[PDB]
Design an enzyme around this catalytic site. Sequence first.
Site, mmCIF file in Angstrom:
data_model
loop_
_atom_site.group_PDB
_atom_site.id
_atom_site.type_symbol
_atom_site.label_atom_id
_atom_site.label_comp_id
_atom_site.label_asym_id
_atom_site.label_seq_id
_atom_site.Cartn_x
_atom_site.Cartn_y
_atom_site.Cartn_z
ATOM 1 N N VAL A 27 0.805 -1.393 -0.224
ATOM 2 C CA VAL A 27 -0.480 0.064 -0.273
ATOM 3 C C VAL A 27 1.020 1.146 0.027
ATOM 4 O O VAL A 27 0.233 2.323 -0.112
ATOM 5 C CB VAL A 27 -1.052 -0.003 1.191
ATOM 6 C CG1 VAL A 27 -1.931 -1.405 0.985
ATOM 7 C CG2 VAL A 27 -0.743 -0.055 1.940
ATOM 8 N N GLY A 28 2.107 1.391 -0.362
ATOM 9 C CA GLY A 28 3.265 2.164 -0.165
ATOM 10 C C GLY A 28 4.059 2.439 1.068
ATOM 11 O O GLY A 28 4.375 1.327 1.670
ATOM 12 N N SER A 29 5.137 3.611 0.634
ATOM 13 C CA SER A 29 5.957 4.192 2.029
ATOM 14 C C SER A 29 5.900 4.869 2.374
ATOM 15 O O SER A 29 5.061 5.499 2.745
ATOM 16 C CB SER A 29 7.692 3.228 1.119
ATOM 17 O OG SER A 29 7.619 2.125 0.904
ATOM 18 N N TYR A 30 10.574 4.900 7.802
ATOM 19 C CA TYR A 30 10.085 4.520 8.976
ATOM 20 C C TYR A 30 9.405 3.193 8.415
ATOM 21 O O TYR A 30 9.125 2.501 9.451
ATOM 22 C CB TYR A 30 8.964 5.496 8.631
ATOM 23 N N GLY A 31 8.909 2.589 6.983
ATOM 24 C CA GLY A 31 8.511 1.103 7.211
ATOM 25 C C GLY A 31 7.574 1.148 6.045
ATOM 26 O O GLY A 31 7.193 2.382 5.056
ATOM 27 N N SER A 32 7.298 0.139 5.486
ATOM 28 C CA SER A 32 6.619 -0.155 4.326
ATOM 29 C C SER A 32 5.328 -0.913 4.643
ATOM 30 O O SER A 32 5.479 -1.887 5.792
ATOM 31 C CB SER A 32 7.383 -1.076 3.617
ATOM 32 O OG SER A 32 7.444 -2.273 3.601
ATOM 33 N N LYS A 48 2.568 -3.523 9.337
ATOM 34 C CA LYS A 48 3.596 -2.472 8.495
ATOM 35 C C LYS A 48 5.024 -3.314 8.708
ATOM 36 O O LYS A 48 5.197 -3.812 9.985
ATOM 37 C CB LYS A 48 3.844 -1.163 9.672
ATOM 38 C CG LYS A 48 4.517 -0.395 9.153
ATOM 39 C CD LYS A 48 4.863 0.675 10.163
ATOM 40 C CE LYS A 48 5.482 2.071 10.261
ATOM 41 N NZ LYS A 48 4.631 3.262 11.155
ATOM 42 N N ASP A 163 -0.642 7.245 13.740
ATOM 43 C CA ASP A 163 0.869 8.399 13.314
ATOM 44 C C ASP A 163 1.254 7.419 11.882
ATOM 45 O O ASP A 163 1.271 6.361 12.250
ATOM 46 C CB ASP A 163 2.064 8.448 14.571
ATOM 47 C CG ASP A 163 2.426 9.249 14.657
ATOM 48 O OD1 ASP A 163 2.727 9.985 13.909
ATOM 49 O OD2 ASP A 163 2.015 9.702 16.225
#
Length: 336
Positions: A27-29, A30-32, A48, A163
């Site tokens: 769904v996209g990218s 702190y983490g992915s 995540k 967040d």
Amino acid sequence: ERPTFYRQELNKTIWEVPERYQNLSPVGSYGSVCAAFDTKTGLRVAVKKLSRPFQSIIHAKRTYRELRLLKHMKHENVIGLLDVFTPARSLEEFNDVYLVTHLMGADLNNIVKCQKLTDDHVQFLIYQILRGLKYIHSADIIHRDLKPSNLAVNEDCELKILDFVATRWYRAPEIMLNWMHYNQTVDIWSVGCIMAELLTGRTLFPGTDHIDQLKLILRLVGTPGAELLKKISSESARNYIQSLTQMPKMNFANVFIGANPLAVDLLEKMLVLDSDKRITAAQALAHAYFAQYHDPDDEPVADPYDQSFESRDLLIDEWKSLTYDEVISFVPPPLD
Ligand SMILES: Nc1ccc2c(NC3CC3)nc(-c3ccccc3)nc2c1
Ligand SMILES: OCc1cccc(OCc2ccccc2)c1
Ligand SMILES: OCc1cccc(OCc2ccccc2)c1
């Protein structure tokens, strides 16, 4: 009692997750984050993968902070933890951290950047933000980064605060000016900026930098008067403020032309330059604008949150081990 994990590569990285989660898709990218299907519940969820959780002391502490904050949030309008897991069997091989939460339709940027909103919707969304904030604030947590992209709304208009556009556009003026001692009401300011945007399809204060941003702010709310200026400890901040050409407070009923007058009234109470006079989340919930949603008996507060760790300086292995402890002591929620 370890579940069976399985490996796969998704664009950037590897992913090693219990078989319980299926059909992972980015769904996209702190983490992915990946959208998955969760076989234990039948719900769509988001998993995540943290990016290099323990690359430094700061990453380490931040990994721990986020896990701590997520484990504590149990409330309808705030992101909560369905699961946390690692592929590691021991502390020694503990290197990857994955978090699982409910997948939510879209975000508030994906709702204001489709139309305006009608008044009845804005009531419901701001109400839900305030009710989530009251809860967060009651734990003595300050969100600090509220903005459209941090509010998850599904197809049913239910809202969860999470967040992780410019952050600056939503930041309270005291934070820009680098006040060390700002409080919870920085978050009320942000809510105010959010609500105005929802009512007008426009970013209230689209500053190009922090100086611009302040100019845009003071232009609406006026320059500080004497009771505020006397609370400003920094000589240089007080000078910037006092040297920038005086502006008067604007009539909000003229700036927000055609808006509901009760929403204009809330906005006046949210966007007070002086943070000591800003309405709180608890107080905002009892404002008239929300009279059809407000119930003083279904606006819960939070259990105490221990954030003493925030003042500690620890080794990378000690933050890591504290994170491991927290992954192991995790109790899944009542799957209802
Ligand atoms: N009790 C208070 C209430 C509001 C305050 C405020 N508000 C800024 C006008 C937006 N700014 C500052 C401050 C202090 C030191 C450096 C920079 C800013 N302090 C405040 C103390
Ligand atoms: O906030 C932790 C977390 C965990 C998994 C995914 C995630 O962001 C993606 C997301 C997608 C849809 C709703 C809420 C969050 C955040
Ligand atoms: O930042 C305060 C706050 C408010 C509501 C939820 C919340 O969860 C913290 C967090 C959520 C998702 C990713 C990283 C941290 C935190």
